[PDB]
Structures are given as C-alpha cells and as structure tokens.
Paper text:
Membrane-bound pyrophosphatases (M-PPases) are enzymes that couple the synthesis or hydrolysis of pyrophosphate (PPi) to the vectorial transport of protons and/or sodium ions. In addition, M-PPases can be divided into seven functional classes on the basis of their monovalent cation binding (K+-dependent and K+-independent enzymes) and pumping specificity (H+-pumps (H+-PPases), Na+-pumps (Na+-PPases) and H+ and Na+ co-pumps (Na+/H+-PPases)) and on the placement of a ‘semi-conserved glutamate' essential for pumping activity. So far, the structures of two M-PPases have been solved in three different states: TmPPase in resting and product-bound states (TmPPase:Ca:Mg and TmPPase:Pi2, respectively)11 and VrPPase in a substrate-analogue imidodiphosphate (IDP)-bound state (VrPPase:IDP)12. These structures have shown that M-PPases are homodimers, with each protomer having 16 transmembrane helices (TMHs) and a vertically arranged, continuous active site structure with four distinctive parts: ‘hydrolytic centre', ‘coupling funnel', ‘ion gate' and ‘exit channel'3. In this article we present three structures: the Na+-pumping TmPPase with IDP and Na+ bound (TmPPase:IDP) at 3.5 Å resolution, the H+-pumping VrPPase with one phosphate bound (VrPPase:Pi) at 3.5 Å resolution, and the newly refined structure of TmPPase with the phosphate analogue, WO4 bound, at 4 Å resolution (TmPPase:WO4).
The overall structures of TmPPase:IDP, TmPPase:WO4 and VrPPase:Pi are similar to our previous structures with root mean squared deviation (r.m.s.d.) values of 0.7 Å for TmPPase:IDP-TmPPase:Pi2, 1.6 Å for TmPPase:IDP-TmPPase:Ca:Mg and 1.0 Å for VrPPase:Pi-VrPPase:IDP. In VrPPase:Pi, the extra Fo–Fc electron density in the PPi-binding pocket is a phosphate ion, just 0.6 Å from the leaving group phosphate in VrPPase:IDP. This phosphate ion is coordinated by K5.58, K16.38 and two Mg2+ ions, which are situated in a similar position to Mg2 and Mg3 in VrPPase:IDP and to the Ca2+ and Mg2+ in resting-state TmPPase. Notable was the volume of the hydrolytic centre, which approximately halves upon binding substrate: from 3,400 Å3 in resting-state TmPPase to 1,600 Å3 in the IDP-bound states of VrPPase and TmPPase, but expanding to 2,800 Å3 in VrPPase:Pi. The VrPPase:IDP has, instead of Na+, a number of water molecules lining the channel, including one coordinated by the gate residues. These water molecules are absent in the VrPPase:Pi, probably due to the low resolution of the structure (3.5 Å). Nonetheless, K16.50 is ordered in both states of VrPPase, unlike in TmPPase.
Numbering used by the authors:
A (entry chain A): 4 to 38, 63 to 261, 269 to 766
B (entry chain B): 3 to 38, 67 to 261, 269 to 349, 353 to 766
Write the structure that this text describes.
Amino acid sequence: AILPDLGTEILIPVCAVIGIAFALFQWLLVSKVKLEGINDHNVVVKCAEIQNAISEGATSFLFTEYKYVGIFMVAFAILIFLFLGSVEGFSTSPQACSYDKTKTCKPALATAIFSTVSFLLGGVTSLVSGFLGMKIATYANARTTLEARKGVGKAFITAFRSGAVMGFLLAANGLLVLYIAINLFKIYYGDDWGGLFEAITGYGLGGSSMALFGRVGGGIYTKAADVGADLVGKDDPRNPAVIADNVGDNVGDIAGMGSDLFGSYAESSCAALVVASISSFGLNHELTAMLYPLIVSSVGILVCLLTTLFATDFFEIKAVKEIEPALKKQLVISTVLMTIGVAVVSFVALPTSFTIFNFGVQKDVKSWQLFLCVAVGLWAGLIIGFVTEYYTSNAYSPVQDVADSCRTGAATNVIFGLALGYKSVIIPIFAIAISIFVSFTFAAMYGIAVAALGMLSTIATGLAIDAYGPISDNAGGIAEMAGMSHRIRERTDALDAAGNTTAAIGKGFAIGSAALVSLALFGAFVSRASITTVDVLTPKVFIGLIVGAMLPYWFSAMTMKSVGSAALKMVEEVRRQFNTIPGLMEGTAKPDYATCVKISTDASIKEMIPPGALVMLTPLVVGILFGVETLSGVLAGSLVSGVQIAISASNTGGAWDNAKKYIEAGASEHARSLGPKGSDCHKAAVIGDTIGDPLKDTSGPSLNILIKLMAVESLVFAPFFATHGGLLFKIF
Amino acid sequence: AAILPDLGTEILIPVCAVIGIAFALFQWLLVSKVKLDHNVVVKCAEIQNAISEGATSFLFTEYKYVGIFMVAFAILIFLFLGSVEGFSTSPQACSYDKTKTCKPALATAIFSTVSFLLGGVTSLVSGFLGMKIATYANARTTLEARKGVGKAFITAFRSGAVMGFLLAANGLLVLYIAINLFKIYYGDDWGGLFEAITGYGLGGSSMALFGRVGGGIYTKAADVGADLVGKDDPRNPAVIADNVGDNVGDIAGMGSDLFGSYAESSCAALVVASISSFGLNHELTAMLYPLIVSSVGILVCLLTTLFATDFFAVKEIEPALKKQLVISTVLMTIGVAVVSFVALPTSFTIFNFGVQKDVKSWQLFLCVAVGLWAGLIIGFVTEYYTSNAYSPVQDVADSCRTGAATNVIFGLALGYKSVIIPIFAIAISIFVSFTFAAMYGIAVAALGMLSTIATGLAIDAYGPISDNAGGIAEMAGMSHRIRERTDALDAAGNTTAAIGKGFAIGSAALVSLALFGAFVSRASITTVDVLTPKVFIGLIVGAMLPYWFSAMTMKSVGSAALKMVEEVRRQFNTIPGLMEGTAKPDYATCVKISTDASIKEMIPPGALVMLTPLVVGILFGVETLSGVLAGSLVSGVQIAISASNTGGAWDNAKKYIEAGASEHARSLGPKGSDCHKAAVIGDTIGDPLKDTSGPSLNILIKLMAVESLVFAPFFATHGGLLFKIF
Ligand SMILES: [Mg+2]
Ligand SMILES: [Mg+2]
Ligand SMILES: [Mg+2]
Ligand SMILES: [Mg+2]
C-alpha cells in the first residue's frame, strides 16, 4: 500500500497528540469562564459551594474505588502471569510458532510477562482518562450553570466543549498508549508478530477488567445514590444523598461509559490485530496494515475534531428547540465524514489484495471489502442509536404511549414500558445480524473486528455527547439547589432533557458495539484455541451454551439486588448523618458528603464482587474443568441471550425516565394533560422512573461487560485452557 | 426381545386410558353427591350460573376461530408435505434404509393432516370438558366449606383430578388409536408411520397457541380489569369475568400446554426410535415404551390420588399438594423400573445423526428417572422462590414497606436469580440423557417429567377452582368461618399453581429440544456450526424472538385490560338497572368483546410463532432454522422462568401481607396499608408475567420445533430459496 512503514508510525502518534492538544485547548476555553454578566452575586457563591461538594464526593468516590483497584490489578497480574507461564512450563526455550509450525517464536513465558505488562498499561489508561474526565466534569458543571445566565447557546457550548475534552483525551490516550506498547513490545518480539500481538491482547483485558469497576461498581453506586431519594420523613443539599447522586450523574456516565467504550475500543483493536497477525499482513510483516485499525482510529480523531467544530464554532445555538438536534447532527456529520475518511485510509494504506486467516485457511479479501466491513459497522452505529432514540424519547410516539399509561395506573406505566424495551430489541438485533453477515463474508473474523472498530471510529464525539449529558444534570441541579433565576433554570432544564434523550442513544451505541466486540474476541479466541467447528449438537457445547445463556440472567439478578440494597444502605447512612451530626436536622451545619459517598461507594464495590466473580471465574472454571470447546458454547450463549436483556433493560429504563421527564416538561397539550408537576399521573410515571434508574444505569450497561470481559479473558487464557483443558474429562 | 409381547402391550395400553377415564367418571360422580341460611345457597348458584354463561361464551367465541384456523392450516400442511415428492403416488425407497421401499410422500401428507386434526380435537375436547368440571365444581367447593376444610378441599381436588385424568387418558387413547389406524396403511414402513403421527404433536401445540396465548391475554386482561374510575362486586361484570378467567388460563391453558408438551414429546420419541433398533426390526413393545410409560403413569397417579382422597386444619393443606407430587415421583420410579424391565430388550441401538448407537435398557431407565427427578427438583426450586412460606418472597414483602419501586426492583431481582438452579437441572438432565440414549433419551426424559401428568395437572387444576371458591364465598357474602376456609385453599392454591408453572417450563425446554434433535434427525444434518454465519445470524435472531414475542403478549394484555375497562363503562352507561340496583350486568357480552379483543391481540404473536419456521425454512436453509431453533430455546427458557417467578413472588408477597398470619406479616399488613398498596401494584404487574407472557413463552419454544419437524422434508426439498437464487 501507498503509505509506508514510516508514514504509519509518524501519522498515528501525531493524530493522538492533535487529539490531546485539542482537548487541552477546549479545557483552556472552559477555564476562561471564571466561576461581564454576573447577575446576581451570592447565587455565584451558592453555585461554588454546590460545585465544591460535587468534588468532595467525586474525589471521595475515586479513592474508595482505587483502594480495590490496586489490590485487584496486582492480584490479577500475578494470576495472569502464572497461568500464561505454565503453558511453557516457564521455559526460557524458544517455542516453534503456534501458527507456522516451521519457524521459531519466543517463549510463551516471555509473553506471560509481556501480557502482564500490557494488562497494567491498559488498566492504567482506563483509570487515568476516567480520572481526567471526572476532573473536567466536576469543573464544567457550575461553569455551565453560570454560563446559562448569558444564554442557552453560550451555556451549551461551554458544556459540550467540556464533554469533548473527555472524548478526545480518552480516545487519544487509548490510541497513544497502545501505539507505544506495540513499538516497545515489537523490540523484544522482532519478527514474531503473532507472539507480539498475543501480548498486546492483555491491554484489551486490562481496560475491560477496569471497566468492571467503573461501570458495574460505579454503576451500583450511582443509582444507589439516586434511588437514595428516600423519606420518611425529613431534594436539599442538606440531604447529602442528593449531592451524592449529582456526583453519580458524573460517575455512571463519564467513568462508566468511558471505561466501557475504552474497553470496547481497545479490546476490539486487539481482536483486530490477533487475526491480522496470523494473516497476510502479520505473516509478511506489513506494518501499515497490521496497524490499519489504528490508522482508522487515528483519522477518526482528526475527523471528529472537524465535526466537533460545527457545534462549537461555525454554527452556534439560539433557541432551545435547536439544542437536541445539534447533538444528533454531530453524529450524522461524523458518520458521514468518517465514511469519506475511512474510504481514504482503506485506499492509501491497504494492499489491493491480501489473505485473512480463519480456521486454517487463508481467505482472499480485496481491500474495498474491508472498507465495507468498517462502513457496515460505522453505519449500524448510526442506525442503532436512532432506532433507540425512537424507543427512548418523549419526542416520539412510544414514550408518550407510556406517559398515557400512568394516567390509568402505576402498574400500567411499568407494564407498557417493559413491553416497549422488549420490542425495542428487534431493529438492533437485525442491524447486528446484517453487520455480521456482511463482515464474516468479506474478511473473516478480521472483518467482524474491523466492523466493531467501525462502530467505534467516531468514539470522540460519540463520547462527547454521552459526556455532555451528566454535565447538564449537574448544571441543572446546581441551578435548582443554588436556587436561581427561573429564566436560568429553564435554560438548564433544556440542556438536561436534551442530554436525557441523548444518553439513551449513548447506552444503545454501546450495547451493539459490545455484541460486535464480544463476537470479535469470541472468534479471535476460537482462532487462538484452534477450534474449527462448534456443534450446537455435541452436548459438550450445548450444555455450555444453555448455561452460557443463563449467565446474564443470573449476573443481572445480582446487579439488580446490588443497587436496590445499596440505596437502602444510603438511606440508613443519611438517617445516621442527621442523627449524629449536630445542626443537620436543624439547619445550622451541613452534612458530611465525602463520607456519604465512601460509606455507600464501598457498599457498592463490595456488592459488585460476586457479579465480578461470575464474569471473571466462569471462564477459569469452565476452561479448566471442561475444554475450550465448552467455554466456546458458554461465550456464545452469554452473547446471544445477554445482548437481548441488555437492550430491553436499558431501553425500558430510558423510556420511563423520559415519560416522567415529558410529564414534567409540559411542552404539549398531552404533556400538560397528564402533567401538573405533582399529579396522579406523575406519581405512576415516577414510580416507573426509579425502577428504570437501575435498568438504565446499572443493570443493562453492566451486562455489556459480562459479555465483553468473558471474551478477552478467554482469548488471553486460551493457551492455558488448551494446555490444561477438560481436567474433568481427563479423569473420566 | 422384550418380555411383554406385542399383543400384551396393545391390550394393556387402552385399558389404562379407559381405567383413567373410569376413575375420572367415578370422581365426577362423587362430586355430584354434593347437591348445590337460604338466599346464600341461591347466591352461590346465581354466581355458578353466571360463571358458566361467561366461560361457555368464551369457549364458543374462541371456537369461532379454532375451526376457521384448523381447516385453513390443514390445507396448508397437506399442500406443503405433498409437494415434497411432486404429489407422487408411486412408493419411494426408504430414507431410513436404501434397500427397502417406503410409501409415497403424499401418503404422509394426508396422514399427517389426519393426526394434526385429531390432536387439535383432543386438546379442544380435554379443555372443553376441563372447563365443564371447573365451572361445575367451583361453587360445590364453596358450599362444602360449610362442612369444614378437609370436606371442601377433597371435593375441590377431586374436580381437578378429574380433568387431569380425563386429559391424560384422552391424549394417550387418541394417539394409540391413531397409531393402529395408521399402521393399517404403513405396515412395515414404521419410519413413515411415525412420520405422520408427529402431526398430532403439531395439532396439540397449535391449540395451545389458542388456549394459553389468546386465552392467556384474556385471563389477565380481565384480572387487570380491576380498575377505578369510579366506584369483589358482581354488579361489575369484569369481577365475574375474571373468575371465568382464573378458570380458563389455568384449566384450558395449562390443559392445552401440558397436553401439547406430552403429545409432542411422545411423538418425538416415536420418530427417533422408528429409525432405531425397535422400529427397524418392528418390535412394538419397545417402540411403544413411551406409551407404556404413560399408561402406568395413570395407574401410579391413580393410586397416589387416593392418598389425598381416602387414606389421610388449614396448616395441613399445602403439604396435601406437595405429598401428591413426592408420592407419585417415588411410586413412578418403581412404576417405570417395571415398565423398563418388562418392555425392553437387554440392549439395542438408537439413531443419532447416522450411527446406530449401543444402549442397554437400564440406561434408558436412567433417562426417564433423571427426567422424573428433574421435574421433582425443579418445582421445589420454584416453591422456594415463589412462596410466602420461604425466605425470598418474605424479602419482597419487606420491600413494599420502603418503595413500590422497591417491590418491583427486588422482584425483577427475584425471578432473574430464580433461573440458575432449574437451568442446571435441565442441563444435568441433558448431559445424562444424551449420554445414555442419544436423542431418544432426551425425548424419553421429557416424557419422564410428564409421566406424572395425571396428578401433576390435578394440583395445577385445583388451583383456580379454589380461587373461585374464595370468590364465590365473598360474592355470596358467606359466613366469616367459611371465608377463612375457602381463602385457606386459595392461598395454598397460589403456591401450588405457581409450582406447576415451573414444572411446565421445565418439561418445555426438554421437549423443545427433543423435537429440535428430531428435526435435525429428519433434516439429515450431521452438524450445526456456531462459526458458519448461516447458523450464527440464526442463533442471534432466535434469541431475539422471545423478547419480541413477549413485547407482544405484554402490550396485548396491557391494552386488552384497558379495553375491558372501556367495556365496563358501556354496560354501566347503556343497560337499564346498572349503576342503580335493578338489573345485573350482561356477563355474556363482557366476555365476548374481551375475548375477541384477546384473540385479535393474539393473532400477531400467534403469527410470529407460526411463520418464522416457514419464512426461515424457505428463504434460508434448515441450517439457519437449526440456528434460529437453538437461540429461541436457550434464550426463551430464561425469559420464561424469569417472568413467571418474578410474578409468582409479587402475588405471594401481596397474599402474605393480606394473610397476616405471622407477626412480620402483621408488621406490613393493615389490609389497605401503605405497604399493601405497593405489594398489590406488584401483583397487577405480575399478573401478565404470571399467566400470560411467561406461560405463552414456552409454546413459542415448543411449537416452533414441532412445526419445523413436520415441515423439515418440505424445507429440505425447497429449502434456501434465497441461497439458491445467488
Ligand atoms: Mg436526576
Ligand atoms: Mg433518574
Ligand atoms: Mg383471585
Ligand atoms: Mg393474579
């Protein structure tokens, strides 16, 4: 191809620098809004004091998280090393390659180390970019609320700039760190590109492993705090739970999504390299083709930068009616730009033809067909988000049909909205099915991997809009609580409901991008374990498959009780707060926020530990006791039945949110029809909302790690399961 | 070569069937000796008359469609199985043995159709007669509460045992009769004999699509027609229309479903074994081993039934039902040991995907046994998760002291965790079955679960009767002593019929798979690769179908309950005398509008189940349909268990508070408390999941297979019409 081995390695890390640079420019412009148009004073001081308490509890949350993360990340690094060393008997003797039997590779010990290096790198990059994101989110929240004094547009812009910092840091870092890791490892591995990219494969697992904390644990917290909206018998800052939630608004949708998307990005990029490593590109050693996934991802930053400027600088917002589109336009602009962008990348850095591995054979693949495989992914993303919009927006028919149920009952609001989520799934599945059936065809599993990266090429703006959402729930709450001009409070609540419609898409975007990555890994694991058939007939698989299909249902049952309990742990903790501290319950003194967070945040991560086991140990148990053939069936069942629950769950929970937020909004005859702000309908809608609060933000999103992480886990430990397979079959 | 000879089998079978029949007649007869101060006895009669006007309005408004469909689909089955051989009359070499000659393929097509019609006609009959004992014996329970608990409960449980035996014998007898009228043609073509007999299974499962989806939507469209504005009061026609509903759903629906589950597992045994030792050689009493296992079931359950009629407080009642189960499980292990001894050779071969595989008859006996003891374990694992008695429902009651949001969250939690142990129970059954026999094992082990279907159905059919007994008391304004007696049965009925809901879904996954394997055995596929996208897109979209099919049964029953509140305004506002006091509401009409509404709401989910084989099987291959049939199984079984158990809890949590019979139940439980209101918002969310969206779900799994088994030659012959074009 046209772009040379230099060209890739001088391009990649420019575009990641440009990314990080962009981000720090945007941060600098949000710093320009110091905490003339001040009107009046003392509400500014009141904002400040709420914004502080946000960080008190935010920076609390993180340190209580890390208290387990270091413990976990070492414990596992050991564990990953032992299990990867033991295939070779920790031999220092160069093994003949597990692909081209003839030529000689490095020892699977020296990958046991190099896997355990990248595992730290990844788990640190997920960590850091989420820290930086938590840090900007807590910065911008009041500096938006404030800029709402000046007007809707001027606020939005200095809120979506903030959200952009998160996307571009997260994406750029994940690209940069990976890019470095490849070049530092390529030093030791030399020409053994197969062996090299089996060790990069840990980076995928590292970010995903972390994602388990950020999205399952932090999820269990965020909605513990939200569902910690409990009397008998006192929404005031004087309730620390209230401000524990506004912290959560940031956690479950910045760290939460960010970790999952970083996960979904990284572990897709590894499954794309491990097929191409044992394909044409990696066999011949054609850097700018191995690293095509990165060339794709690196243009993606460049593209998304440009498309971000349409909503930041060229066009600018006037009316609130224009706001929810401006977000959605971004999505189309990028999708559209990226198709042109990745049309060039395909042209300029792939050879016209090559072979792509699958199950022994080298498949022939013309390089336009790889363009179709990212494109199909690119555009299924755009589709699957919009199908979602429809099912989870008060704009469209079906959310309003739910709102009309809460007239008749609270039992009806919930019934109609269970049914809504259930019916949501159809288009996202068929959409996936098509993106598979295109992709499996053109390239093989490398196509499916490419296609998952396809969904995630746009991942800066994709994140930015997801990141914009919780900034505006804080901006909202910082106005409510600081008690501001009803003019301002309307301008925030505008950004709020727009972000609400937007962050349902966000969950959608992810639950498909998962299934695509959790499939990419799955076959890239089969391609490690050297399986070539998986008979649903042969009972070794089927029993594993039916049990695999059950695991999300079980896993869910944990994440459900987890949040339900820990919210009751929050209630008991506020009861304490009032009944120990003096001047709260009176009103002289405030509560201790930091402690509300900590005491609740542990009780979450504790509650996370069993779900986390079921994710992490299912492969180790199944893979040891029964073969890789049986773990194969498990990983398939977890996939098929799991993605269903994930969609239906977080769509029902978005639907009910916006049904309640619709009644509240009163922006139609019908909304007003149901919607006195505390009406009989509003009760049955808001009963519905809190049931959704978990489904939306804890149970459904957690699900897309159970699929993802089980796969990278197995991919990594495929050697170990191959070398010590059915121990329960060895004895019998 | 089998001890009990081919005469001895054929003479034994329909004795048992008729012996069950004769026991059911005897049991209906004894429930007639209960003849129906004053003005309360006529109150009860006034209700019992009105129950029958509603139920018999429903059934007749359903059969408006059942005939219309059965004939239309009969057209369709013949035309499709015909076109396989070009509607040819000239006999064709046997697919099971290339040497010998089989009958012409439209001989199967005609004969499939005959058996399809029989099976529908038996499902229809067994449900019709089942109603006509529930409707009859509901008040005769309430009245007999005037003679205590154990004298009411007996004359209730009998009424359900009648239907359980009537159903059991009828299905066995009609299959048996069909086999001999069919052998009459096929002769030595035992493969092509039992190829037609499987229509019976498709017949029985289609009438479950009417019974427990249409009748499903109705049963809990009425129950959730419990709605203000404005106002148990019989001047509201929905109040009674539900007492018909409590009957229809768990009599006609559980009848039809477990008749279906039975038929299609027995058919799936027959097909497999027709191309194995037994049916290659032509050894009847070894082929018909399924039917011998069944027929002893009747006899074992007849004995056990008498433990809860002749041979033995309100605290005593729930055990009465849980013994009825354990008894006939312990009996039937001996019962089937006998059947396996006296009707099986030392050793044999079973067809799995080409190879005639070594199987020794004791290994076959372990297959019914491992199936038998799954079906015992699985429903006890239910009980634990759906009973006010045990811990996890008592947790859900403590939820409603906090939120009504919390009641539902911790219920959605409940059912989700519910699944784990039943899934291992089903999986452990699978691994042991496939080992010992192969596909025959699974199919036998599914019959192992349904070997106790006589008494199994009795406890499922006692349930709703004793809801009507609790409500016939309430509406007839009876003695408070009497109300605390009938409502005692009601509550143990709520436990028991929740167990039977897990029993059925247990059975289902097993039989769905017995069929799946048999569909692969007919289609001649040696593999089903999860790698090949032909199957993967199948598999993922199979997992999607139940979520779709739920969304429909859900919003069906949702708006259908709101159509029932619409119709109750019309009766109050058009009839002279109602709203005042003069004239009671027309019950026949309040069922009519609601029933059509339900069966019209049914028709699109009833379509999703029915076309999907056809569209997949035609457009794409039997490869793809193999994919789709494995996804819908593994996924839909989870959603099936999650629903009915999530619902079964919230009901029993409400019914715990209402009961108030322990200090903790008093703790939450003023009979309209802050808690009780949250607990009941639970129940009315659980009503569709209880008796509509979860129990229909198992017919999506079941019927998609039998339909696919029957049309598998047509799908091979004119298969991937899209793969073929490119
Ligand atoms: Mg909020
Ligand atoms: Mg909320
Ligand atoms: Mg009732
Ligand atoms: Mg009910």
